[PDB]
Amino acid sequence: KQLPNLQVALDHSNLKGAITAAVSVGNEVDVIEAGTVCLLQVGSELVEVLRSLFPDKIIVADTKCADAGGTVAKNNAVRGADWMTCICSATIPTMKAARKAIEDINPDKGEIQVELYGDWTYDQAQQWLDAGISQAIYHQSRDALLAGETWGEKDLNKVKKLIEMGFRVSVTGGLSVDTLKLFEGVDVFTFIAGRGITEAKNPAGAARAFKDEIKRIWG
Amino acid sequence: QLPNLQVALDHSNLKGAITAAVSVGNEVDVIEAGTVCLLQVGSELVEVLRSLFPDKIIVADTKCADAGGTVAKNNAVRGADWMTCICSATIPTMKAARKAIEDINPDKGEIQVELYGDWTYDQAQQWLDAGISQAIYHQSRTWGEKDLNKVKKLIEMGFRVSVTGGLSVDTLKLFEGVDVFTFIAGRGITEAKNPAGAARAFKDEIKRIWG
């Protein structure tokens, strides 16, 4: 058993913003993620820079891969990624090819995570598990997120159900040190924070406070 | 207009994409920076292609799922005409992407929906209602009736449909009578002994059939 991870997403539109934010919080987080917006802007060298700065941190290449799973996984695994995202639209053969490629380069830590967008089903989710993929990323309902709302029961129910199916579930959106308590009793695998922490007055302090609260609730 | 010939650049490095584009650019209508390539090299490739081919349609194949306005802006400022969104992107994301690309590129700026997994005609109608009327259809993994029939309905609904997968000079026959908007070729053309000649042959067969 371990505590939920604190992950920082880097969704910057340029290389300097990602690197500066990563350096500001890196020591205080468990996982550092090169976000899709950033990767589409700067390419995969960022993954390698992050690996150099943080030899022992978990690194996520958030490619939201839909196709050419083996190639995209290999491309980011050789840069040093541990986890890569596939969009839930990706077929089972694409997801398996990506898993096989990332495991080939990184047997110890290599994994695929399914990014949950649109009308995905639990029947699809079981297909991911059967294909050896057991991480999923769940986003707060965007309407509620944009409105500043708490996590609603419907969102919590889906998170709970995925966990019960056997997923390690990461959540993102609507997360702050004060809102972690909403998740009390929910076996969240990773909390993914972004600008709330990296744009704070003291990002390292904000990151540590977030992890302190994870420790209070789940410790 | 006849169906467009498009070349997809899915290389894992910059030199591969640039070399392939230069080899066939004059002979095609549309040049696409594929997702595999953009994830490797970033968006500068789009602006390089725009400089090389000022009068060609340029596609930024980002398969955008979220941050629509940001992703579309980032690629439109590089000179993209069309950008792909994955079909699982929400309507708000697709709409934000469309509005951002139209703002920078009022001439040609458009979103195209990339079709993967279990999509429905009901979802497709929401894309049309959202102002998005291009969709990319991939051969199931010789074009058979199930695939052709889906292509035909999408066109009926009001989509400009691009097709990709299993395309050659010889399989263009199979699409006789269908109002294909764009045929997307890739390595079949760019890895040929004479890429410019393979592409020209391709466009010549389009001209024969739809001309």
UniProtKB/TrEMBL annotation, chain A:
This is 3-hexulose-6-phosphate synthase. D-ribulose 5-phosphate binds at K64, G174, G194, R195. It catalyses: D-ribulose 5-phosphate + formaldehyde = D-arabino-hex-3-ulose 6-phosphate. It comes from the Bacteria. Pathway: One-carbon metabolism; formaldehyde assimilation via RuMP pathway; D-fructose 6-phosphate from D-ribulose 5-phosphate and formaldehyde: step 1/2. Its EC number is 4.1.2.43. It is an enzyme of class 4 (lyase). SMART domains: OMPdecase (SM00934). It comes from Streptococcus mutans. PANTHER family: 3-KETO-L-GULONATE-6-PHOSPHATE DECARBOXYLASE SGBH-RELATED. Keywords: Carbohydrate metabolism, Lyase, Metal-binding, One-carbon metabolism. The gene is rmpD. Residues 5-210 form the Orotidine 5'-phosphate decarboxylase domain. One of its GO terms (molecular function) is metal ion binding. Mg(2+) binds at E33, D62, E115. GO terms for biological process: 'de novo' pyrimidine nucleobase biosynthetic process; L-ascorbic acid catabolic process; one-carbon metabolic process.
